[PDB]
Design a protein around this ligand. Structure first.
Ligand SMILES: *P(=O)(OC(C)C)OC(C)C
Length: 372
């Protein structure tokens, strides 16, 4: 497959954690430094109902769903599935929020890269009906049987958009906060029964978190979720909004974010009415950075950018004029530098500090949308 391996020194493991089993419990995919590097065998889109969900999102049918499943049902992503957690160290932790029509597995290039640099990543699956699909269990016996209840994307009427997107960003923030609590709780001995029966022993996570080093990151709906989560939850020490979609946020949020905030935008997606919300977060007393990736489209941040060929990708807008690997290294490296600065890490990420300032042939400092 063409999802890139991570560039950092650690090998990368992957597993899923759902707790509690209910529609109100937490559901996340974890990426983490693994002890060993035995095979890059993780299944990318691990269930057929995601393809039905994804098709429902693209406004098509049962047939497109079956086509996607054929194209992608067996694609892997470069992480050792259920591999042991690399011991002897406390890792900084990232909570990741997916965009509208996505789900927890679709930003593995980001997650796997961060994990190869020593982060644990918890990519959350939202149950706000913004995911194409997701699932949960109606009772503990259903979880033992693997008897999943599915939840599919809600389509909205224009008259619903403002209220519902807002309610969803609030729930989303609460899901980020709650997923954080879950990991923090396991970090500190909380016994936990994974609703999914997986080989990875969640006890490995006991005493594995550097609890002061917590960031929230997210793409597009997930960008808005970064900002909301930051405003509510001070355990998150900084934010990185990947081509945020600002529309869901209420006016109240803007004055309420003390933590450092990084906007990494695609050249081809942004518009003034959206950029203007981003500019409202700026204040001499706060740290905000913004860079724009030259030749990039919105989809450059998610994994479908790696799923097809140049020509098809370009025509479907999964790819822009920049190389997908070039784009995702620029985003990841900038991110790593930002994390090192605002989490106080003692690594070598500050070598890409100039990428925070847009100092690359493939970056614009700030935004091409010059609206002030
Ligand atoms: P975001 O949540 O981006 C997805 C396409 C990944 O919102 C857009 C669709 C407006």
């Amino acid at each position: 497959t063409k999802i890139p391996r991570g560039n950092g020194p650690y090998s990368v493991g992957c597993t899923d954690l759902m707790f509690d089993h209910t529609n109100k419990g937490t559901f996340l995919r974890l990426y983490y430094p693994s002890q060993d590097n035995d095979r890059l065998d993780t299944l990318w889109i691990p269930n057929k109902e995601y393809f039905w969900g994804l098709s429902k999102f693209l406004g098509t049918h049962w047939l497109m769903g079956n086509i996607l499943r054929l194209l992608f049902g067996s694609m892997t992503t470069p992480a050792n599935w259920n591999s042991p957690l690399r011991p002897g160290e406390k890792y900084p932790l990232v909570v990741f929020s997916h965009g509208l029509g996505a789900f927890r597995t679709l930003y593995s290039a980001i997650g796997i890269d961060l994990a190869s640099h020593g982060f644990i990543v918890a990519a959350v699956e939202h149950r706000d009906r913004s995911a194409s699909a997701t699932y949960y269990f109606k009772d503990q016996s259903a979880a033992e049987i693997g008897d999943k209840s599915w939840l599919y994307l809600r389509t909205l009427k224009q008259e619903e958009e403002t209220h519902i997107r807002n309610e969803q960003v609030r729930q989303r923030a609460k899901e980020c906060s709650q997923a954080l609590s879950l990991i923090l709780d396991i970090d500190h001995g909380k016994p936990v029964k994974n609703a999914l029966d997986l080989k990875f022993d969640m006890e490995q996570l006991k005493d594995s978190i550097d609890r002061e080093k917590i960031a929230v990151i997210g793409h597009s709906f997930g960008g808005a979720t970064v900002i909301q989560t930051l405003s509510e939850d001070q355990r998150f020490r900084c934010g990185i909004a990947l081509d945020a979609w600002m529309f869901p946020l209420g006016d109240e949020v803007y004055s309420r974010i003390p933590q450092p905030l990084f906007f990494i935008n695609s050249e081809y997606f942004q518009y003034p009415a959206n950029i203007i919300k981003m500019k409202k977060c700026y204040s001499p007393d706060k740290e905000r950075k913004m860079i724009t990736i030259r030749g990039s489209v919105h989809q450059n941040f998610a994994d479908f950018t790696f799923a097809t060929g140049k020509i098809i990708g370009h025509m479907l807008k999964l790819k822009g004029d920049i190389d997908s690997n070039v784009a995702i290294d620029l985003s990841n490296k900038a991110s790593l530098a930002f994390l090192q600065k605002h989490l106080g890490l003692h690594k070598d990420f500050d070598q890409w500090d100039c990428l925070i300032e847009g100092d690359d042939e493939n970056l614009i400092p700030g935004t091409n949308i010059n609206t002030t």
